[PDB]
Design an enzyme around this catalytic site. Structure first.
Site, short mmCIF file in Angstrom:
data_model
loop_
_atom_site.label_atom_id
_atom_site.label_comp_id
_atom_site.label_asym_id
_atom_site.label_seq_id
_atom_site.Cartn_x
_atom_site.Cartn_y
_atom_site.Cartn_z
N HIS A 254 112.34 93.15 6.36
CA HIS A 254 112.59 94.50 5.85
C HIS A 254 111.39 94.74 4.88
O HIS A 254 111.15 93.77 4.07
CB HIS A 254 113.76 94.75 4.89
N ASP B 9 111.87 93.00 1.50
CA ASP B 9 112.18 91.58 1.47
C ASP B 9 110.87 90.84 1.05
O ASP B 9 110.91 89.78 0.41
CB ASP B 9 112.62 90.93 2.72
N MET C 202 109.44 92.00 15.01
CA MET C 202 110.25 93.18 14.61
C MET C 202 110.09 93.36 13.13
O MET C 202 109.99 92.40 12.35
CB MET C 202 111.66 92.98 15.13
N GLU D 74 120.61 100.17 15.30
CA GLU D 74 121.61 99.11 15.14
C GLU D 74 122.94 99.60 14.51
O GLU D 74 123.05 100.02 13.36
CB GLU D 74 121.07 97.99 14.35
N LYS E 75 126.92 99.66 13.39
CA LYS E 75 127.80 98.94 12.44
C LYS E 75 128.88 100.01 12.16
O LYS E 75 128.59 101.15 11.86
CB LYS E 75 127.12 98.37 11.23
N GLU F 50 124.47 93.91 17.26
CA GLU F 50 124.67 92.66 16.52
C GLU F 50 126.05 92.15 16.86
O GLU F 50 127.06 92.88 16.88
CB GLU F 50 124.47 92.76 15.03
N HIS G 154 128.94 92.80 14.31
CA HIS G 154 129.15 94.24 14.15
C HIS G 154 130.11 94.76 15.18
O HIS G 154 131.10 95.47 14.86
CB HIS G 154 127.77 94.89 14.13
N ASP H 36 120.79 90.98 17.89
CA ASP H 36 121.00 90.20 16.66
C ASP H 36 122.18 89.25 16.96
O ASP H 36 123.29 89.76 17.17
CB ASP H 36 121.29 90.98 15.42
N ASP I 129 131.72 91.69 7.07
CA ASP I 129 130.56 91.23 7.91
C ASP I 129 130.21 89.84 7.38
O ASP I 129 129.66 89.69 6.25
CB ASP I 129 129.52 92.35 7.80
N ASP J 56 128.48 87.26 9.04
CA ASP J 56 127.12 86.80 9.36
C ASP J 56 127.01 85.30 9.38
O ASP J 56 126.10 84.72 8.76
CB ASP J 56 126.10 87.42 8.42
N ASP K 12 120.50 87.01 12.77
CA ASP K 12 120.67 87.78 11.51
C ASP K 12 121.99 87.22 10.96
O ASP K 12 123.03 87.82 11.31
CB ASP K 12 120.74 89.27 11.75
MN LIG Z 1 121.63 93.00 11.89
MN LIG Z 2 125.90 91.88 9.96
#
Ligand SMILES: [Mn+2]
Ligand SMILES: [Mn+2]
Ligand SMILES: [Mn+2]
Ligand SMILES: [Mn+2]
Ligand SMILES: [Mn+2]
Ligand SMILES: [Mn+2]
Ligand SMILES: [Mn+2]
Ligand SMILES: [Mn+2]
Lengths: 393, 393, 393, 393
Positions: free
Chosen positions: D52, D55, D86, D179, D181, D215, D218, D243, D253, D255, D291
């Site tokens: 990102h 980041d 990406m 993406e 969500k 994802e 998600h 993802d 979420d 992850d 991710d």
């Molecule tokens: Mn993601």
């Molecule tokens: Mn997520």
């Protein structure tokens, strides 16, 4: 694989006998004869069969019909050697039970339902069942003002304590096991999870002979951790029977084969039943009952396929769960993570709340920032269980 | 509207003080001073304020800092008249509590957490709080093999019974209230619902002073009927405190204003708190505490707006809930539906399980097909509650 | 609130005709004669009636029988003036449809299903319907290896494009409306939400006459916001029909009366149907159709009560939703929160990407921290909405 | 199983760089230096890294700082050979983004957000990425009256088409991947599932270079089947990136590591990525990106362990999925269940609608009850899959 009667795989008559009527369609299978059900189950490796009263005897059957049906039924049991470990009552299909059995708003239906249970308690005892299950499928509501919620629980207590009291009075060697379900067929069912069921038993006069019958799919319909929930039942000494099946998510009760839902949870369910707790404690030694439904798309080859698949699934998970706990890298992974450290009392032998009162050694001079660096390594520990499950290790 | 101190509207310091850091972003509001929080709350109509130890006193504060902060805090209380009805401990933010407080795998963290609770019990007593809340937010796991599930409950029992034992030992006029949550921050939290919390108390040595603190949003994260769940807590005589807020569905804990989630459920929650049960029974008479979070998009005008809106919402629902039960068409609708009939015992005074043994009058000569015709009229009854809620009637 | 034919409330035959059979029980009501359904609904205020081919004409009906039934039904319609705005096919109740109609694995079944649909397009055209709904309830799987998923969508496409081709060819004034459902009866249903339905339409040779028929409870079975989902449908101009009912969370398809589920969500759907978008945009003009089921606990007085409750609920919500937007206070709050600023394009007329990157005020010298201070006051706009909903304003 | 650059495993900087801060607590790990992230991942087997803008480059970074950081990062990349496939923008952490970036109510914020994206397209192009991902995490509302929903989608469209216009104009080899969500951080997020993302793309002026980035966790936060959802994406040729992670039900979420959530669903995603469709069709060829977030309970040895667990999990699943389809028994069972028959068009070459209705064998004389007898044997094909998954075959 290769299940044998010492495995204690018990199946309900309504599972293989389920013909396929769902809410959007008619049955796709021809009815299954009970004598035929008993022969097939015995030949597959089952240890016992369970049923709901109206699974064997129609609601309408006469005394003459009832005795004819029990005679062929009892001869089949005899011919095969199957036991009848659990019996239950149907308090949900007949239109009369539309607002419930024990918690029906109609008092005359309440008596009728209680009467049906008492008689069923006599048949249970006659079959040699050790557990009497109660699934309160119509006890609940769609609307919140439909019931006086304190009264509904008083009416539930009256029903359960009258049946217990009766067991005790006749000296049957029977225990009651309540089966929680959060919803369906009602919008909200009373005692919807293991927790609610367990708390409820603590309010009974005769709670000593009342315990639970958790079902995988049912706790998963509330999004709960089934292993967590049975652990709590086991810890309280109230895990009297169990219903194993699959559920993929929060939706209608699917009743898939055991292992065809949440596979990783099923692995950990089998480790708890078979291996019990890391540090030692209570163990569940009852039967492994399969409360599932053969998918409606499949014909009778699918029905016998599904019954074997439940047993297969449990024995393959059992095998990987035994190898997992036996593995010296897993045992060391567990020691790193503090699984055995959790087993040590917090307080030292003889230390009081004022003594510890946080001691500091445990409060004032404690280095919180240093204790926080610890690598619990739970991820690595989870990877070890998946690899064992995948047959990789 | 117009809340007054006899309403018993209590608010947590962390609610209005919540600055907006969520998992995807930083705080959007400047910190809120506690003295400033007390003045604003008193002026809005609140009766009391509650806090978590680290809400007032930093984790790092020295004894000198602690006494400075309590002095201004205590003067504000004095200046305004706010009570401090409940106090709780933070066992979740500091990195040290990453695997839990009481059920941490690390024994030294277990002692540290227990020590922090014991001292907080002394501050609670000093503030005149009647309830000590315990929210076990980090007690749980992401992975099923991370814990010995029987040991985790033994460690939970040790912590809770040492704190109770200490209350009893010092004679504080304090009760403990556990606060269930199914998940977040952990994947699975121990004692995830009202049921689990209630069962768990039954296993304690000192259960007599332990009860619950259910939160609207939290039972709704498992898909459960909040009114059903508090009814069960109330029926067991264990509803010691309550947290009111809004949740729209099974997702992260939203903590919206009370009434901004499931509106029809909030109506029936207010009817149970205010009106109690149709047939009579127990009543909840404690404070109405608002455990919510002002939406991060709003500035401080939103924060005071949201605090008033919780009180408003409760008084508007209260008003429609009083008019609803008072309405003679509703009372007649309730009699038709059998709401009062549910209140009658199933068994006649003196009738035994053998006497009834289903009697028939209640078993053999019962007309099940005729009893099944009854129109319970639950739909019409639900329509009467919605119309009353909508202000239509 | 009295519905008039002008309101355009449509009901399906299967709705008030629902006999009560669910997965755990038999019907609790006698079958409804179609003639009486039509007459009864006409006296309540309905605009029209809708049906599935087999709700009216039995699967196995001979030709003489079919003509009789149509004669009887066409008679009632002429007598009462009821319109038949939508007709749909039953591709889910007979055992042949166990794997689906259009996406069955068996090709002869796929052909039967399509033939069955084509003939029903003729009937629909004879009846004067404008909309032809497709609910693919058996299209999907319980298990992930049961289907070749790319082939499932080609087969879906082939049946829908063949149906649409046929409409175009025949010159019928019919548009097809796809109706999403995430699960039940299958474990996973193809094209599960409004989003998947809209996506699929774009891959169709004849997607110009193919649109959506979203159902309230269906979108809520995946926890989505119905109002957001029909707003996307409208925005794409694909909102051809709508099914209103109520659902109380993620669980089995309850099909409760409109407004008897999520109440605030019901209010905002009505505000969207009635007021359109705050900044203008397309508006929904079709029938307001209810696809619900009278709870099985209720007898026939409850059926007509429930039918009536749907239209009552809608009109009461409409009255509130109109008072909400007409209020000056509400308009002011909408201005402050930026509801009207959202409608202003982000760029300036003929401003390109390059020009934007380069505008210094917009990026390089934008004061992010200053901009972040805006109090959106969304809580206060929400409070205003609920206060209008409760009729306290 | 050892990953090689050939495997195309990509990781985000924010993934192994996740410091541990959640909504109930502070970070438990020190920040990660980007240089070390890159070197460490290179030694584990990664193909590439993704980030990102913020980041890597702090929000407030001066120009000298930005150049330094890029010099350092570009250095590490040259040293290790890591690709940067990406790049994405952070439109959710700073307080300015509280109401969204592209669909904020405030127009100046909408402009800042778009400027912020355009500049990041330049960077992405400099870095050699092929994919530009947009995750609109703050786009949505907590309350239904907060947004004009048709205007929310025009604003969304205007930012995405402006970004795509700019790519085309500049001649960059970049494709945009949306993406989805459903919720979190907002109560309801615009374009919540794969279905809504695909639908929206079709309304875009430049939708040819706009695709999806689904994802795993998600889609499971709405309870949908990930394998079905990416199968629709593929079928429409819009599966531009993916993802992978794990989620254990409907909740926040999580992850978790790929395969640490729903295991059987993970196996079937891998079978789709690796084997494509049983009857042939498009195949996914991009990066296999993870991710996820290393649980906060784990220190840095756990971070690299977790990174490694993702690639291990994928390879082990791949090995099983390849053995599954290669098995003769599995192929036979697929033939019997009609997995290959689904691929046969329903009609005959040049057979029209009319010709089908008229074919007697297909409708009028079709034997529905005979056809319904087919045993699809889907349970047995599922059992075979699980048995391959468990490596017992
Ligand atoms: Mn993601
Ligand atoms: Mn997520
Ligand atoms: Mn079940
Ligand atoms: Mn069961
Ligand atoms: Mn909460
Ligand atoms: Mn709380
Ligand atoms: Mn429905
Ligand atoms: Mn429908």
């Amino acid at each position: 694989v290769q299940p044998t009667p010492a495995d204690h795989f018990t199946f309900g008559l309504w599972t293989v006998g389920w013909t396929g009527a769902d809410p959007f369609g008619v049955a796709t299978r021809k009815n299954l004869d009970p004598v035929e059900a008993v022969h097939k189950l015995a030949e597959l490796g089952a240890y016992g069969i369970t049923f709901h009263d109206n699974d064997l005897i129609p609601f309408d059957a006469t005394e003459a019909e009832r005795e004819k049906i029990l005679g062929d039924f009892n001869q089949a049991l005899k011919d095969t050697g199957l036991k009848v470990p659990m019996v239950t009552t149907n308090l949900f299909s007949h239109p009369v039970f539309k607002d419930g059995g024990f918690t029906s708003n109609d008092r005359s239906i309440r008596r009728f339902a209680l009467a049906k249970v008492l008689h069923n308690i006599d048949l249970a005892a006659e079959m040699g069942a050790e557990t009497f299950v109660m699934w309160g499928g119509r006890e609940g509501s769609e609307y919140d003002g439909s019931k006086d919620l304190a009264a509904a629980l008083d009416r539930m207590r009256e029903g359960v304590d009258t049946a217990a009291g009766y067991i005790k009075d006749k000296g049957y060697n029977l225990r009651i096991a309540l089966e929680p379900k959060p919803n369906e067929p009602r919008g909200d069912i009373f005692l919807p999870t293991v927790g609610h069921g367990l708390a409820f038993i603590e309010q009974l006069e005769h709670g000593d002979i009342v315990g639970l019958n958790p079902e995988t799919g049912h706790e998963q319909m509330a999004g709960l951790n089934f292993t967590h929930g049975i652990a709590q039942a086991l810890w309280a000494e109230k895990l009297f029977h169990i219903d194993l099946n699959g559920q993929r998510g929060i939706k209608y009760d699917q009743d898939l084969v055991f292992g065809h839902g949440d596979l990783t949870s099923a692995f950990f369910t089998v480790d708890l039943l078979e291996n019990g707790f890391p540090n030692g404690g209570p163990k569940y030694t009852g039967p492994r009952h399969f409360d599932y439904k053969p998918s409606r798309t499949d014909g009778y080859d699918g029905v016998w396929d599904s019954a074997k698949a439940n047993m297969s699934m449990y024995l393959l998970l059992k095998e990987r769960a035994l190898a997992f706990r036996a593995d010296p890298e897993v045992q060391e992974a567990m020691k790193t993570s503090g699984v055995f450290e959790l087993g040590e009392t917090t307080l030292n032998a003889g230390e009081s709340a004022a003594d510890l009162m946080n001691d500091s050694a445990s409060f004032a001079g404690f280095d919180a920032e240093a204790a926080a660096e610890r690598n619990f390594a739970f991820i690595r520990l989870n990877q070890l269980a998946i690899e064992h499950l995948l047959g990789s290790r």
